[PDB]
Design a protein around this ligand. Sequence first.
Ligand SMILES: *C(=S)c1cc(C(=O)S)c[n+]([C@@H]2O[C@H](COP(=O)(O)O)[C@@H](O)[C@H]2O)c1
Ligand SMILES: CC(C)[C@@H](O)C(=O)O
Ligand code: NI
Length: 425
Amino acid sequence: RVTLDYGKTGLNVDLPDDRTLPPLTIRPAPPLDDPEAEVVRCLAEPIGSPPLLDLARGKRSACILVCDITRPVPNPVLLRPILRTLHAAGLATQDILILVATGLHRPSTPAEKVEMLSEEIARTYRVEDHYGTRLEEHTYLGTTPNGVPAWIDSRYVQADLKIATGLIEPHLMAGYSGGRKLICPGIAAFETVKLWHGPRFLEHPLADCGFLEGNPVHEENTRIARMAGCDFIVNVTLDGARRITSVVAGDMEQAFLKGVAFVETVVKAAVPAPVDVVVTSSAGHPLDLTFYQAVKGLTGALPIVKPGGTIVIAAALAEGLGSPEFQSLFEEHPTLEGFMEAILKEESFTVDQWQLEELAKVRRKARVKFVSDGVPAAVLSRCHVEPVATVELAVAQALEQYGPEARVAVIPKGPYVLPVVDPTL
Ligand SMILES: *C(=S)c1cc(C(=O)S)c[n+]([C@@H]2O[C@H](COP(=O)(O)O)[C@@H](O)[C@H]2O)c1
Ligand SMILES: CC(C)[C@@H](O)C(=O)O
Ligand code: NI
């Protein structure tokens, strides 16, 4: 028996005792007893930055970037200390904007802002959404040597004090989330993101979970974030039960890299050899709201599945497939091969196409069996995965296909784990 992450509930799965490896879990580091108290300490004694109170002295306006619903940041723990310090520094609440760094996602709803930030904060401060398809809401900052123009939300660019908050987890393109990613793509225009999420970046072998140095995705969004600037970040890591295990604050690069150095010691989970069947999740609510995001569970499993193996994913998909643009690509391109011909041979850019490219990367290596009650089977079958009614059935089907030597690995927290093959094991 194992509980996979699945919406707000989890999912209780029975897996074959004689076939299944011990579950891949992140290392059990101690949670912080008082993470808000720790945030307070880190604001007074940050990494590579003056104390936030000293940074905020004499500033007339502030913009605080926060993640949208898809990231389970415990925002009030981070924001209450920040907001207290800004008030102490003399900034009035009307001088402070909380900007939801949607990237190219849809805007957060009023209810989501309350879920993300607490009723007290959502009611007291101006909270606005980034709109990536609205170029007019962005300021041009220059073009990188790789040819990517930097278009960043003007409300942030024009703020006296720039602050970003977030969460360091593995990421299938940028290696890890957090730090600079709140700026690029969090408040970057489609004119920027379409190129940065273009196949010239995404087909690179190091554009993958866990890779920073040498990953052009990370080199480029670091460069673009530095063209905008960021005076101060606060980032956390979360364990499997969503307790904060570390807080980093200060310089946008130095604090981020300190947080990554910690999370690298807990998120890696090794098997001695790749396996024919990998059971995984999309890390539950809120990440697994859409099929668009749940592709992350599929890419996360790739390092430990054998070529031609099967990934079995469970995800609640309570919000369905994703954006209208994302959904339209399945209708416009019934095969992944035709989709990849479209985007590889010409400069063809459609919102959210990058996740279809990631799904194509998955399907070049593995079959996928998809278990969900949030999207009908008939719909999922048009999404280049095989809908199966239960994980237990899906595993039984895969084990018959691969035979009596086949083994099962299981990753209950899905893309929040970094599975690796360690032959020395
Ligand atoms: C990372 S590539 C990324 C991409 C998008 C797209 O729409 S593309 C959106 N976001 C959002 O930006 C915020 C910061 O990202 P992080 O990965 O959590 O550091 C967050 O609100 C993401 O949902 C990111
Ligand atoms: C799913 C990916 C492509 C992006 O939208 C993100 O939220 O990380
Ligand atoms: Ni993105």
